[PDB]
Amino acid sequence: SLTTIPELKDHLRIFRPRKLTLKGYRQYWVVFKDTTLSYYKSQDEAPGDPTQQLNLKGCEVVPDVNVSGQKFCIKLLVPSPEGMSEIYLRCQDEQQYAQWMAACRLASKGRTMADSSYASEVQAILAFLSLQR
């Protein structure tokens, strides 16, 4: 009948290396559903004007972490028919990094946030971060 699917929605800071127009980290409104990440400039522009969307299934997920430096970065390496796209996500705190990273790591494997091991994945990441500090 009625079902409910989990999503992530928040503002993240994003950098795109190989976009040959100059642009560093911008705060965008970013939404994660199923195994696809979509980022937008503004909330009003959600959901049907995607500045960028990408299916993370099959991609490389590179953690880029320095807890003492308040660096919570996720590097997504997405293959394409014309080479690799890179998408760098910077989160605001440890909780946000844990949710967003758990989601990216599962999605890379084709598993969604509905998979029963997503919660233990978040909590596992939080533990990781908390013990480094």
Numbering used by the authors: 345 to 477
Show passages lifted from the paper.
The later identification of the kindlin family of proteins revealed them to be key co-activators of integrins, alongside talin. Talin and kindlin interact directly with the cytoplasmic tails of integrin β-subunits, with kindlin binding to a membrane-distal NPxY motif and talin binding to a membrane-proximal NPxY motif.
Here, we report the crystal structure of the kindlin-3 PH domain together with molecular dynamics-based and biophysical characterisation of its inositol phosphate lipid-binding properties. A salt bridge in the kindlin-1 PH domain (Arg380–Glu416) has been shown to occlude its canonical phosphoinositol-binding site, and in the kindlin-3 PH domain, this salt bridge is replaced by a hydrogen bond (Arg360–Gln396) in the equivalent position. The kindlin-3 PH domain has a mixed surface charge distribution with a pronounced concentration of positive charge at the canonical inositol phosphate-binding site. The kindlin-3 PH domain is closest in structure to the PH domain of kindlin-2 (RMSD = 0.69 Å), with the major conformational difference being in the β1–β2 loop. MD simulation revealed that kindlin-3 PH domain interacts with the PIP lipids primarily via the loop connecting the β1 and β2 strands, and that it has a somewhat higher affinity for binding PtdIns(3,4,5)P3 than for PtdIns(4,5)P2 in a membrane-like system.
